[PDB]
Design a protein around this nucleic acid. Sequence first.
RNA 1: UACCACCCGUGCAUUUCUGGAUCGAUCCGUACCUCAAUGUCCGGGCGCGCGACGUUGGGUUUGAGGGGAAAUUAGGUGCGCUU
DNA 2: AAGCGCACCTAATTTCCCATTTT
DNA 3: AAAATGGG
Length: 1076
Amino acid sequence: SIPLHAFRNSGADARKWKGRIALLAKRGKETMRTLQFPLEMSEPEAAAINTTPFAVAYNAIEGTGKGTLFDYWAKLHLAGFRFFPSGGAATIFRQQAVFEDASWNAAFCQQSGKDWPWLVPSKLYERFTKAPREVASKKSIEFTQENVANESHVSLVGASITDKTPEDQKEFFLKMAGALAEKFDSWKSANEDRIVAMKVIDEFLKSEGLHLPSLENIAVKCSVETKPDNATVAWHDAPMSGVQNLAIGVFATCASRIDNIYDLNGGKLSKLIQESATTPNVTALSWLFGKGLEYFRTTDIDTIMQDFNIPASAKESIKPLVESAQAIPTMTVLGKKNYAPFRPNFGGKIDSWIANYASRLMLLNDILEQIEPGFELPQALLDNETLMSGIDMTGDELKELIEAVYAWVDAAKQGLATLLGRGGNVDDAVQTFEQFSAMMDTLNGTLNTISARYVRAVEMAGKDEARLEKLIECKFDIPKWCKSVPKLVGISGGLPKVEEEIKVMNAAFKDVRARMFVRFEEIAAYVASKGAGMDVYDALEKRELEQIKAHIQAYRAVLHRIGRAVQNCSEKTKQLFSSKVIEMGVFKNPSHLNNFIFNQKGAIYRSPFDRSRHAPYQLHADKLLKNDWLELLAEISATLMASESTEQMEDALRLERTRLQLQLSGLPDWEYPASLAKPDIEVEIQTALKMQLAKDTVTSDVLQRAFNLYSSVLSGLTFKLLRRSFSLKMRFSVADTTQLIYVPKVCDWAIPKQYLQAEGEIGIAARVVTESSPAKMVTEVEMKEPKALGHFMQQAPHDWYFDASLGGTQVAGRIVEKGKEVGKERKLVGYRMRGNSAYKTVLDKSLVGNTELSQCSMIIEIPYTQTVDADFRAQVQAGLPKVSINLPVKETITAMLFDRFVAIDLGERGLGYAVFDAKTLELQESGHRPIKAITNLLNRTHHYEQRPNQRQKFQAKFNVNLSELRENTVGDVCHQINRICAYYNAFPVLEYMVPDRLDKQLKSVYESVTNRYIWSSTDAHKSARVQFWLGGETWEHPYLKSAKDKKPLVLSPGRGAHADENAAVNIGGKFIADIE
RNA sequence: UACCACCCGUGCAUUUCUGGAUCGAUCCGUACCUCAAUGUCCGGGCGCGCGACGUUGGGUUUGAGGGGAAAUUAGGUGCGCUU
DNA sequence: AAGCGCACCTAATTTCCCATTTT
DNA sequence: AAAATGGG
């Protein structure tokens, strides 16, 4: 019928097509997706929003410093407070002495011969503490022999009674449960009669003839109340004193409780500390972030010591906890009085860290155990002048470095034990791994320098035997363990303080530039005192001293460093400079001049150490020597002095540092006083340079490299000063069910009259409607026909408002909350939710039950612009805050893919396809579909791949989000494969690897598309694939069988394997040959 | 299947309701973010001020995509200096 | 070609996005 | 509506 160009698999329909392929899935999950609704605010309303209280609350919830919840949470874990899921659970733990679990259980195991460790007295006083709940398939809460036996077996042994379960276990509960079922009418009644229930089980055990101690007696002792009411925490462990690293200490405290930690993997360790740290579903955090936060903040230290029965010894470890409690500010936003509603994302953050840190501890253990002792460097190499030059240390300091690395592998093995809870100072083990990583970085750097120098010396020596023989005798191989040591995982959060940041970078830029000019004058003063010259042309007799391991190179090295500065300047500057050089006519080709100056390609000077094969740019020598190149730099700088454009200002600062440094590159070969190389600015110094620096005298290279630190901090500050726009995004999620305000429109509605002739819910409602207004209409439907309300409300004129606790419009509305009957018209306050019909159809489907709204996230985004003045001082300006609701939604699929397959080739301009019958594996149709989004991505990212010096400026200058542009292009290619799949009722067959001939931006796209159809081991790929196919993870073809295992094919729902059309027919051939 | 015609970037204007309910009709849903398309501005390139060169070249969908948020780690790229 | 110092851009890890019932 | 926590 219609051709493929006319076929429409898009929008709500592609989501129905996929909902259906998903229902064909062998295995799969339920997915969510967020829909963002901007809240409508007038400019008056947006101006009236105060973001200061929102900033205070977000910094307490998300900050990892003082006054935050990470600091109250960590200091609870470090004071000796174990966390428990309920309060009941904590009271039983605080009564472990009374129970005598071990003793009782051992006696039962011996007397009965049953050997049932799970039957301890404590697990029984529990089942009579907690009643079960009719989870809604619904459970039942009535006390029956069947009910109680199942509930008691689940609590004690952790599983429901099944046929597989040994009969002895089943009978033991049945007989007990039978006694309990006879004696107690209800779980409610049994829970009240704790002592009586224990007596009953004691009688059951005595009837069976066991001489075990009285549980009833235990119950009387256990029946006193633990003072802090409903506490989910119990003090027990000794306190970890003065841990600067808060999270790393909490992980160690928790891991200390685990036994045989080394056998465990990252997943297992993560799950056992996640349970002890945040507790399952952060149920403990409810109390600590609610009534617990009040207790610690508002109880005499003496009564927090009495109520948890803490020894006087730990008082100094508890004194800090109360300060950390008291420091978190009052919760004043989203109508919330305390922090408990914010627990779900606090848990997610900590649990994320715990999982990532536990994997990193387990990695460092494997790395530390592969460091093989005995690596040594040949004595020859340690005495080849050439291959030990430029490492800032002698051969007797590289020997000592390799010895230092082996000693630090032993200290690192003990630091890891201390971090996995085995014992020690945690803060002196973080330091060990730092000092270990630093030593191993210095060794890896030094050996990369020496191996590079070696392969350069070999090539240059060439055929000369004396050179080659002495070189090959210095040969060494870098050991596999000599690598960057992976760091310990950190944790941070809170808002960037914009006004403070700007103050800091303005202060820093002015101070560093002052200190750089000051030092250069001090160096020039000292060289003047001894009467010598900073002759930059003579100092390139150094080109000679390195060459052994002249004038042409001296003048080419001053014109290549001057030239490379212009390459990083504006087109104004690039022209002013370029013309002057063309007048001189130094270059054989002026094409090469502008190629170098404008296209940033090639060079007019190469260092001898450079392994590059491309010859420097040809020049006429006479012109080069005739003209002073340092003179040009003064002239260009002078032209760009008074421009007052920020782009020209930045060139002025770059060329200033180029002039200062080409003068310092001309210093005579001497020994300098070592205070002419000591930096007063804050910068990282490599440890080789810093041990070279802590001496009486330094070489010219040390003087020069320490001065380049001035320039590297200035160039850094420039990236932060030249930021033009950014936003402060604050996200808040409570643990409360999403409530939407359904506001009927204040307009006359003429209900369609065909609605009366229908047997549906809309029919039922349309029949009973007599009133004019849609607010009065919905009241009339509610009162007369209440089952049909929902369907009538979806059609009746309405708006959607949200009560962010920020004010808004007073509206007459009915609250629409999940698993609740719609509210009665109350007067309410809310901000209208902006959105097209496609988004609002998802809110209307919720009234019927076709969709479920989840707990939402409110996002306050505050926009900012930044500008630099004449003095290059940055200024920031904040716009009106935008508020939005990010609503996670779940949606039901209403109740083809196997009988054909389509091979898809991703090519340069679009895709090709070839469809075969899955039954007969024959060719039925082929075609090519140009995608214009591929051509647009290669056109708008051309100057990010061919102008390398300008990739940190391509986004702000060209107003692009390359991530978003790649997201749109993956959007548009997946759309076209999904459209072809839908049009021919075919499952997609893709090649496994994106070719390496393709542009870097297209390779990225073509690999975010192969990973939504083909299977990938990487979790990120599987997560993306499943969310794309609406929870569908695995599919199984009914009749197609793999050659490899003679198993039915697994699809996802694709299978890994004109030019694009030709290629797809070949991908399809490859797939067929891999099936029976 | 008729249609359309140098290419790219930047800025400006314009378009972009794309979802439901009932039996084409009636009613509900006000339309966010991004990509695009349409015209215009200036700059660059190519050919002969002007541009498709039988023809390809392109387009055809109800234009298309929209799962957020937070922390983390690792890698890559750039600039400068030294050997 | 390497090394270092300072930047920015990208890709992957891990977690959250309860419900039930009492008070 | 807020607090506590069951049921995996």
